[model samples]
Structure formats: C-alpha cells, structure tokens
Target: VKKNDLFVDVSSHNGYDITGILEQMGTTNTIIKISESTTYLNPCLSAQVEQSNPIGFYHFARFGGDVAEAEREAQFFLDNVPMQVKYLVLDYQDDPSGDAQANTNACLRFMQMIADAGYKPIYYSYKPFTHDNVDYQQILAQFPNSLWIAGYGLNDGTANFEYFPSMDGIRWWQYSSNPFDKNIVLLDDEEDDKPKTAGTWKQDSKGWWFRRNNGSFPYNKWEKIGGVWYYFDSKGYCLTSEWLKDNEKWYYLKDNGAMATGWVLVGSEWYYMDDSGAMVTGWVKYKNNWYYMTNERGNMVSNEFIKSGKGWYFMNTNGELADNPSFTKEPDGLITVA
Candidate 1:
C-alpha cells in the first residue's frame, strides 16, 4: 500500500470503523484506489467495503497447514466467485508463531494447498512475521515479498500509528486494529500498475491507455471498440501488422485504425491502395507476380494486355509466365482482344 494506494483488510467482519480516516489522512480524491484495479475479488468482500473505503475487498481463506480444508475453501471460492476475484488473504492468526523459522512451514503449506487447487492467489497478509511467530526473512524469501506486516503500539483510543513497531524487510505495516485499522502502504511493481476501476479504459503510469471495456474487452485482452475490432498488444498499445483482417475488410490498422495508403502486402498477396485504404485499379508489378487491377473488381487479370513505352507486354497473374497476349488494333490505335 503505497501512500494513496488501497489496502485489502481481512477480518473486516471484526468490526472497525473506517468512515473518515482516508479524508483525515489528507487524501484529496478520497477515493480508495485498488492495485491491479481490473482484478476483481470476492463480490461479498467488495460489497461489504464498497460503502467504507476504496480498497478492493477479497475473501480471506484461513489456512495454516490444512491442505484438505484449503482445497475445499479454494474450490468453493473459485466456483462461487467470478474469475476476476483473484487475491487471496491467507489468515495466519490461528497458528500464530513465536519463531520466525518455524512459522515458514505453516505459511508454505497453505501456499502449496492453494497452488494444488490450480489457482495461485496473490496473497495479502497484515499480520507481523514476529507477531505471528514467523521469521520475516524466510517467509518473504519463499513468498518473495508477500506479507504486509501488522504491529501496534498500545491502543489508547485514537488512530495514532506511532505505537506500531518499525521493522525492516516489510512492504506494508498495520499500525492499528481498532478505530479502523490502518496500514503503511507500499506495493510491488506489477501490483502498482493496475487501474483504479474495473471494466473501464484507463491510462497507466507510462501514459498508455489500456482498454477495460464494460462488456467485451477485459484488461489486456483484445476486443471490439466502437464497432471496429482492434488488436492490443500485451501492454495494451494498438498494433499494426503486415497482414490483418477485420470482420468485413482485409487490412491492417493504418494508424491504429485509420485509412491505409499506398502499396500494402496483406499475407502473401500484394494489393495496392491509393490515398484511401481501398483496393487500387491499375497495372502494378509486385514481386514476381504482375497483377492488373481489373475493372471487374473481383478477379486479378492474367494474360492481360498492358501497353509499354515501346510496344506491348502482357502482365502475368500468379505465375503462368505468359508470352504477351496477341491483340488487334483499330484505326484509333486502341487495342482490343484478338
């Protein structure tokens, strides 16, 4: 939870009031922003916190070393909830550890249980490593910076976070558990890049807008926008390839969907376009195949009569290697098929 970023709090069922803390923290927008905003969590969690703060609520699965119980919880949540509901909060409060090294075994067991179910949950935990009888270094090394540690000073009454113990190797700190528990915010690189809303187009820190369509496109996937099918690369930038086809036409995006101009090679065949992106009608030699853009507007002309500077040469279509079509001419010098 970087400053101004959202933090998911489990045991939100435990009853803590978060009504005015964000505004009190000087958040001008007063909007709690989600990390990887497009990623949906449990609707139940979301529904609960929707009125409270901006944090995306996810269902917490309490697991220490119970594989059977973990799998059952994972299975129920995975099926009952939408796939966008991704992050899973691992509850370590039950098996609180005193030894940092000993606690790693329990955490890792739950980690394995979740993976065995075919869903690798982005884990979030506010409990302290030492606070949970676990070691900070070992758990983080195995999970590679997964925990958001929880610590607190004597809770006299107010949300005074100064009482929370300061520790190293921690990305997040939970300062208070009462009167609305608050955490020190810092996020991993990829998590920090998520949009603040789901199913809406938003620009990233890099200034590139990734589409998250209301109905069709989701986050990074390609889908229709404004009736035109557009391809978005991994980073969500519109792309233009050598050969591309929309539902109705054959053409790559000229400039991210503008008209294509000049000669364009679509697939193996070569087609010419004028200032606009329409197929051109004229004699154009491309590669070894010479094609005549015929008036018929359908078939490519083969064994066709084309006037050269000196005399006459027949343009071959595909690869017949035709020896100039024979032709007769009128008094007007206009050639006709012989």
Candidate 2:
C-alpha cells in the first residue's frame, strides 16, 4: 500500500469473493475475475468499478481450458475498462500439452493487447491444483517476472514452492487475501538488469543450443522465434526447445471436417518449420531412422508437406527441401498418410 496503491479483481471464482467485497465495501483495490467475464459479466463489472476506483483482476482457470472464450474475455476487458484498470492475473492450474494452451495464449494476448493499449499486466498463481500432476514451473516460464505467485502459507505444514538451486526471483507470493507475506514486488538482482521473460533451456533432455550474449552469467540464447531456450545437449547437439508442442494432434472440430494433425508414427514422425524455426515433433522418420521433434504442429506439417502445394515442404538432412521428383523418388522415405 503506497501513495498510489490500488487493487481489484474482476472475475472471482473457486477460492474467494474478492471482487464482491470491493463492491460491498465501496472501497477500491478492485477484484477482477472470470466468473461472468466469459459472457462479459466479469470484465463489465470491472469496468463498472473503475468508474469509481482502481481494480486488480484474476481468472480461475481449470485443468481443461476454454480457449475461444478466454480470448473473448480478454477483448471484453480491454474494450470496457478505463485506463485506471491494469491486468487480470492470468491463473494457471493444468496440463496443456492443446486447446487449453489456446486459452492461456488468449489470456496472454489480451494482456499484451491491453499493455499495448497502455496498462500494466501481472500474472498470478502457481503449481497444479492437482497433486503430483503438471509442472507449474513450465507454465511459469511464459510469465516469468510477471507473476503474483500463490506461494501462500498454511499452518497445516506444507511449502508452496519448488526451489531451483539458488534462484529466488519470484515477484510476489500471496500469503492470504488480507496479507501477502514474502511478497517480493520484483527481484533485486546484483546488477541492474532487466527481468527476462524467457529463460534458457536447462532440461535433462538433449534439446536446445545455448549461446548467451545479453549479459554475464551464462544464460540460454532465447530464440524469439519460439521463445525457446537454445542450449547444447549432453550429446553436444545444438538444440532449442519449447515447453509446449506445436504438432501434437487431437480430434478437433472444424468448419468442414474433423481432422487429426499430430499423425506421428510410433517409430518415425514428421517435422515442419514455423517462425519458431524447425518445429519437428511427433517422431521424425529419416530414411527409417527416427527422431522426435518438440511439437505436434511440426509433425503435422512434415507428414502433410507437399513439394509445391501451399502446405509444408519436406527438407533433407542438409536443410534442402525435396521437390516433386525427389518426393516421388523417395515416397516411402518422405511422406506417409498414416
């Protein structure tokens, strides 16, 4: 609480009635939530509150997500609320390894959109709602320093964090509704450096190629293409990896047909390139030798690639793509419908 300390949450659900209390108390520090925001209820209320005071917002997310609706909600908030309003803390509590990711992306896009429209954004919450399930750190990567972590305290004896060697750079830890203890508004690094949203790839797997030059202290070379961290694997292969897969397919409904794109062979998969570089996933089948790309979209694009069509074009090991003659020559090696 400072000279200009204001708060609010628009769409409150599941845990507390923060938004309701604000309305009842006629006090500011608004609570924005996800309750009626889907139908524009939550954000509308936020806009209504902003007519008088400041606001803080958060969404109650589920393990399974609603992407389209989430995107819609973001736009609603931007259109309705005044500039006095800041961000709705995007809450994450699940495993999106498809559609659920879209919801998260939508929320992110909304935050950026609002930010571009002139407002501050803050990410909220951490960890899976379910025990021993999804990894919150993976999702946290997307929000990095923009977090208002729910590293809350419980008298029942349970810690709310997963320590990473010696790093302690989380922005805020919500102790409770009334009091947020150990809440670091922002990390105080030894040097006056900017907060990095995307971090380096430090997984056990042989993925990513690392090259750091931004500053000292050996960090991963962040490929803005995919927000992936580039590093060297144990095998010494230069790799850049993403937490989410692009080619992983599922049964999705479309305007005309329901199709599955992540058609990867159990042994060999396919790969395609996006602005994020070569997004090869499912399983890459090269001359019967198989490798795994990091995303579902990579798999789909590779399998369905055509030499001249508007679809993906298959590339050789040398980064050279195959044409109609080469595709026809290596039919078994190149494309398979399955």
Candidate 3:
C-alpha cells in the first residue's frame, strides 16, 4: 500500500485474525462488513474491532428499490455494529432491478435512516456502477463529501493517482481488491482519524450554524469562538436576537451573535444584563444608583412610581431610582414630589 493512510476491509471470508497481516501492511484503519441484508453478520468483527483504529462498518445492500427491505437492513446493521465504529457505510453494487430512479431512491432512504440515527453514512460502489444505477449527484447533495468508490486497474496493491476515479466526493478510494480490499483515504491528513479542536460555519435557508469536524454540531448549548459567545438551538441553528434560558439563567444574544451585557433596549422595553451576560432581575445597583428590574420579565422599571417591598420609589427615564431628597414618603405610603 506504500504507507499512505491505507485501510483494509474484510468480511468472514478473510477469517478471524488478520492482525499480523494488517501490521505487516502498516494499515491505519479497518472497514468490516457487519451484515448482509439482515441475514448475516461477519464473525471476524470482534477481532477487527480489537485491532483497529478509527474503524468503520459496512452493510452489503441487496434490497434494490425496496424501502421496507432497506429499512430492515439498516436496523439490522445498527443492531449488530459496535459503538466504536466511526463510519457506517452502505455497499450497493447490485444491478438496477427496477428503474434507475427507484434504485437511487431506495439507496437514499437507507442512507437517510442511518444518518437520522446519528451515524455518519457513506456510500460505496464501483465507479461505473455508481454512474449507471444511481444518481450520484443526488447522493452528493444529501451527504456532502461522503463517497467511497472502488476502481481497479491492475491487481497490484499500489494506489496511483494517475488512475484516480475522478469523482466529486470521494473520501476513500479502493484501488486493489486482489490480496485484500486495500483503500486509500482521500481527505487531508489532519482530517483523517484525528480529533478536531475547531469547526466550520454552515448556512441554510433557515439560518447559519456550526458543524464540528466530526459532523456533529452544538445544539442547545453555548460555544465560545473568536472571543465571542454564541448559542445554538436543538436543531443546531445558531440563535440570534433572542432570549435563552439555560439552567434557570437568562441570557440575551444580539443579532450579531454577541452576548448582551449592561443596558439593552429591545422594541421599546429596556433590560439590564450583568457583566457575565446573565439578565438581572429585582434590584440592581449600578453607578451608585439603584434600578428595579421586574421579577417576571426582567424589564427595567422606569419613569413611574412603583411599590417595592415596604417602600414606594420613583424611577427616572434612565431606569435609575430617585435620590433620597428627590421625593418624600407620604402617610398613604406613596412617593410625593419634593
């Protein structure tokens, strides 16, 4: 394999223990076929898991254009595969039984089920098989950068880029299948099997969101990036110009994704946020002046006389309480102008 981040895929046909051969070949990863059409499981899966880093599992697809059968096969693969596998692949190489559109639709459904279950889905097939039976463009549109293609020239174990398959989203290319199913990773070295410390920004019709390097995103959580704090929702969409209550604490995120602090005005209502970006309620003392923020909604009480505890106080338009000499307490417990 020439030691270029190679991976070897095996099934029951390869026997249980190929660890010595794997070490001899300097393999970096392994892809094991876990199941075939909900009927079979590779007996060598346990040994492969015990001896691989960044492992992946593939399911041999036999249900062409059959949505129910595809769903069952996906569930079967999910039930049998271990949690350590990083990638879940669908191996669809059978000829198109129905129309090409129907076959592609079924493949999409199978992959979608795997993805909806929160696993990375990869499609595997020969280059010509992909071009003939499936709509590769649609698959790319749904799962960007997730194609594992096989193209063989000679039975040699070397992967020559000169004979590359020339596909858009090829993450892994299987160059030789004679001695072993040898493949080479097409992604950058840093992106392959390494923990990522950063993520990238993605946008859709709804709004903008962040996608972590592992294909997951921050959801219903706060992420600090570039010295600024941003909030994400359950759907992994970054929240803006909204109030979020997390663990009984309220915080406001501005339209620019910056946390709001100090005094902020929103649609004729005034609010006060502490330095830590938490909304302040009740009495807040700032700049030697006391201000009252309503307990219910945290809106600043301003330009009116309101009752607080055992005293009545007047708040100016700036949300500051009047000084001691600015008003007098009346016998009826009301604030009288001095």
Candidate 4:
C-alpha cells in the first residue's frame, strides 16, 4: 500500500490471455474468470498493465486429451514469454492430478522453461485441489517455487488442500464458490493462447533421431517428390524438403549425406534414372547420426561396421543386420541358389 511499491496482485493467470481482466473487473488488484483459452506469460498481454506490473498464470485440468497436443499448448506460452517472468500461478483444480500430470508437466515446463530462461513459477491450489490422494513428493517435487493456497471460511478447524503438500499461504481466494467480492466482474481476455510447437516427420531408422525444424507434419501431410516425403507446415507454408534445411546450424549431422540420385518423373509418376536406375521402393531413413542409409541392394553383404567406431546407429526395422545369405552351397558339392 506504499507509494513507491505497489502490491500488484499477480495471481489469476490463465493459459488463456486475461490481459484486460482488471478493466473488466473494474478493479486493479484482483481479476477473475479468464477463459481457459487465454494463455499466460504472453507478449500480447505484457502491455496490458498501465500502473502495476503484470503477472501471468495457467490452469491445469487433466482427464482426457492428447499428450502432444498438451505439449504444443505449453509451447505457445513459452515461445512468446520473455526472460525472468516475475510471477506465475498453477491453477490446480482437482487434487489427485491425473491427466493433469501430463498437463501440469507441460504447464510447469512452460513455467520452468520461463524460469530457467529465468522467471518465477508458482502453484495456486484450493483446499479441494489439495486432496491427500496426490503425493506431494511425487507431484510437486521438481517444481521449485512458492504456492498460493485456498482455504475457505477457516471452517472445520482447518482448511485442507492437498496442494499444501508442503507450504501454505493465501495470495488470494474464492473463499466461497460465490465471488465474495461482488464488484469484481469476471471478464474475458482477448489475447489468444500461445501458439504451440509443431509435430514433425523425422528421419528414423529405428531410434528417435535428431528431429529437423520443419515442424510436425500430419501423416496425410506427406508430399512426394521422386518418391521421398517433404511435408508442408500446418498452414501449407513450405517448410523444408528432405536434406534441405533453411537454418542449417541446428540440423546437425556429422556427414552431409546425399539423397538417392537418378529418378525420373512425369507429372507425379516417377520413372527410373534415364530408364536405367532401379526403382526406389520402400522409404528409408538414416539410422546413423551422420545421415547414412543402408541400401541392402537385394543381397545381404553382412555389414560388419561395429558400433564401436563410426557412430551409434539404430537398428533397421528388419533387425540388427545379422549375416543372412540368400543362398549357399550345401555339402556334397551341391550348389544351392534359392
């Protein structure tokens, strides 16, 4: 309440943007009811504040949804937020933290990524949200930050929030399901949720290889050129083709391997290289970090390159490449070529 220092209530962060929340409530210190769609730690809402510093937050509701989808949702916030966010709130609704685990994992990642990039990440949980069913050590162990707890009426001699797995304090509260502060009109934040990181089709021989920055492409997003896939971005924006990188720095590979050569084309129909080169049948990805492929060439030559030297390459889908011959001569001088 001092002149120089103002206690800007940085609580009430929605993954959805709640930028003008104060204006909607006709108040400065407290804002309520930002849509789930409104993401927190946004560059879009950084300018929302006139007198006080802005605080950000996100909510967690885990039940049934996509994991990758959730990760993308978190990336939306992380990408936009600047370094060292002053405050953060983890909206913990149901205490047990089921699907919420995956969600909060992303949410907290958004927080920690912001934090490690340097910022503060805190959790806001009500008594009900802090059910004993959820293990504090198991749940909140990795997140190193304070918490804004809710314990209403102080009834039952104590307010029990499982979120209190450790510390306890009240930054703000609903107190009752009914808004105690009648003047606080719950409004919406127009800023959209942060855009998510995309999915991508990576070069995979067997293990997860270093994924390119082309972003995630849907299975149907494949674009075949000479029988190789080069998917576009979500918006049909041409990303990069195979072995074609715009920002080549991060696309690290020890060796610059060339793709298969000699394949003709008519419309979409691909012919041989000058009507000579064999037809490139199945799709092959690089197993080695250096981006080298294993062209079996219809015969098993038995590649003896041990993992001890060059690079740790993943096994081809068929197997780890045992020495299996197409045919061999049996005893009694019987030449068997099957």
Among the numbered candidates, top TM-score falls to: 3
Candidate 3 residue 333 Cα shift, in angstroms, is 92
Task: Please give the CA lDDT of all the candidate structures.
Answer: 0.43, 0.39, 0.72, 0.34
Tell me the TM-score of model 3.
0.55
User: Model 4 over residues 25-99: C-alpha lDDT tens digits?
Assistant: 334543222223335333334433433344443434332233454345445544544333344444545523355
Ranking by lDDT: 3, 1, 2, 4
Which is the better candidate, 2 or 3, if ranked by TM-score? 3
Per-residue lDDT over 1-338 for candidate 2, one digit per residue giving the tens place of the 0 to 100 score: 22112233333232333445555433455444534254434535534454435445455444235556556656665555534544455555544435544545655664565457665565555544322333334444654555555544452221222221122334444433432212222232123346564334333454333333543223222233132233332453333222223245322211111121222232232443322333334543332223334433333333433334332355554566655433322232211111
TM-score, cand. 4:
0.33
| Candidate 4 lDDT (Cα, 0 to 1) | 0.34
Worst 10 residues of 1 by lDDT: 329-338
> Per-residue lDDT of 1-338 in model 3, one digit per residue for the tens?
11124688888888878786587557647888889987888888888777776458999998987878889989999988786555799999984665778888888888998888877789999888888888989988998878999987775665544467878988878887878888876653223344344778888999878887788888888987655688988898888888878777788888877787666665455567765778767554332233456645544343334445445467666667655433333222111100
lDDT of 4 at 264: 24
Ranking by TM-score: 3, 1, 2, 4
Candidate 3: C-alpha RMSD after superposition: 24.5
The residue-level lDDT of candidate 3 at 28 comes to 48
RMSD to true structure for each model, in Å: 25.0, 21.8, 24.5, 23.4
